[model samples]
Target: GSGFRKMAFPSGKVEGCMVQVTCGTTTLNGLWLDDVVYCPRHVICTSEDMLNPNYEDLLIRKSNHNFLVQAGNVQLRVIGHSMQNCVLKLKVDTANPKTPKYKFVRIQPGQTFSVLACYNGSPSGVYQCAMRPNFTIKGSFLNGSCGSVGFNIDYDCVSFCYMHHMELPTGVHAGTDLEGNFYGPFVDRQTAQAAGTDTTITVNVLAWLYAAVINGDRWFLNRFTTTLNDFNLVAMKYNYEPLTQDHVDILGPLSAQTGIAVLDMCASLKELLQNGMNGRTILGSALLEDEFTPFDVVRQCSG
Candidate 1:
């Protein structure tokens, strides 16, 4: 039959529905008002039947070739499934679309293709595995569209090469899905560990401490409390002792952002985590700033 089919969104009869016919080409030329607006995915009609006559290629209502975008510390990768040999174009910063990056790959049933990093070379070695930034990833298949998802990279992750070393002790961190898209930065101690809590102890600890000191946000404190518990758990496993009062007392004394209290906290926690999970070093950016106590501070804390 030749009726209306919605291009997107399941609210078929709601407002802002397009009266599409003959696929997306024959967008009828009609003032869609009143409370009765129906649309379609694709139909068999001509321009002569259009109410407003909008003629252009819109997303097919039943195409499943949309893309799945994965974000890496160095770049972004997009993967899509296609029915046959196809060419896909992905645009970054939709606000100001640049020369779209094109990917030409063969995809058949039960097959897929991927495009890693549309442009710009990967970060240098010096950029290391220590940085965090926000990113917006969205794309469309040759004939389909997909929802855009954005996430905050807590840290660029401990170098892809070191992925084997960093394991989430309690919560989730940036990880890939079975399909290819990267997801998460969830809250928890395991997540902190995976985010290099062992090395970046000061940054992670100071983040929560400062949040408690300044904003007094329960969420951050809860986070700090959970991560601190993990740290204590490590001590329990090692020396069979937890930093009960030691951890609490510092909360009050650890006033300054980068003071003796900070060093004291790092110094103490470093020993608790000597040669444990996430390796045996406090390699965070914060420790590097206040004082370059990389070896002395991180190593000496072992005893």
Candidate 2:
């Protein structure tokens, strides 16, 4: 009951067998077959006991076993479980003895433990287990002794926010206006109307153009002279119908005075133009950039 005890094996070529051994302060529940003996969990055994053929077979067959063996020196193998994508590394304090050697083990996924040197005849100390980089460990620390010690650590990979870019139509420039509002490039009205193929137009310019045409607003026309000129050139070059007061009246009222009002007008214009054009409408950034002194701002992903 205290030292080495030899028990009779069950008759008829034992296929599966279990043995419970109690020695000193340690108790081991072992499972064995033909040539191998396995402990159900972490257990302590003497080096002389490990030299037994069945125990050697257990050591050779199962590489991921948690065992602490004592000979002239002590060696420990720590096996961790239930940890997602995590593995472990260990360090022990050898500088002091009475203090109870403390060791830290960092773990990673799919990794097994290695033989660890002990400071005393038995592994009696506090052990710490930490997760590898990019992972967080749950219940990272534990205590161990000459007796059986089991560790159940839960872990998970860390999540992070990554930067991405905004998707936009090709050839459309992006920028912030003098007022710090964002905008995308636009297609002048005449080019859109005259094109035989569908023209891709941005909403910011559509709203600006809508505000200019419907309201005959000096602010919009003065602010967007380049865009207006571009529109007029296309009409004159192709001898297409030019924008007129009749066009303004047909588009409804002059409700766009402020940036917000223009945005509202832009939304209406998008639907109105989408219904009328062979061309298609694309929503741009919330506000329009200055037509004359446009400063480009590369589009970025929204938060």
Candidate 3:
């Protein structure tokens, strides 16, 4: 009763289909019968799978005001909040045995913000939230364990790669590389964009790579084939080496499905070094311009 939805299939058959749920433009996450449901990740063709369709189940909160929680590098993004007009700050202990990583921002109830720091420096690399969303305590320091407070927090193991936190020890290379990585609450995608470097492949390839980050067959196919059709962007650096295993796994399949040659696909990739455009400029332009729809600009980029 808490989370279930009944639905029909596009094929009108009980055989099997990977059913996806989206509100307006956003895809949903959860389980379908036995299949653990997630978006930008996966879906499947199946049957007799009842879905827990409760929004409440999607955002379960903790009552404990003082406890520690953990996930994949703790990729935290403040996706939702209860504040009216407030500033949010996060202070984190990155297992340096010393200083902490911190970031603060003003936010409305629905606005989101994150500090992109990777805590994969150690096995027991514990990062306790010293300051929760509202910074409920005034003088809390590194040892203070604040509640994992927020609205719809996504604490998953999202390959953390941002490396500017002072708490991080020196000498890490390729810290800005996200070529074909996953994104989530605090995965530093924004931070990478801010630093003028993001996704390491062209839109043609990144679309498939992005899909690979998801968990299933049809799901990856949908984004790789459909999403890439609309927009394309360039890569930061040029690499002449052969494609990686991921390319074989993701792009190789995408090529056969779409009938687009890998050569044409590579040629289509716009290089940031060639044009004056930065890695994230296309995304920023898409967000700001109105005269032309974002995808329209993306189409121009694709052409």
**Residue-by-residue lDDT tens digits, candidate 3, 22-48:** 222322221111212111111111112
- Which 10 consecutive positions of candidate 3 have the poorest summed lDDT? 8-17
lDDT of 3: 0.23
Quick one: ranking by TM-score, best first?
Answer: 3, 1, 2
Q: What would the per-residue lDDT of candidate 1 be over residues 51-114, giving only the tens digit for each residue? A: 3322233232223223222222222222221211111123222221221122212111111112
Which residue runs does candidate 2 get wrong by more than 4 Å? Answer: 1-47, 56-126, 131-303
lDDT of 2: 0.25
User: Each prediction's TM-score against the native?
Assistant: 0.21, 0.15, 0.22
Reference-based TM-score, model 2:
0.15
Candidate 3: RMSD over Cα atoms?
A: 21.7
Q: What is the C-alpha lDDT profile of model 2 across 218-279, one tens digit per residue?
A: 32222222333444345344323234433333223323223333334433433333344334
What C-alpha root-mean-square deviation, in Å, does candidate 1 show against the real structure? 21.2
Error of 3 at 231 (Å): 19
On a 0 to 100 scale, what is the lDDT of residue 95 in model 3?
26
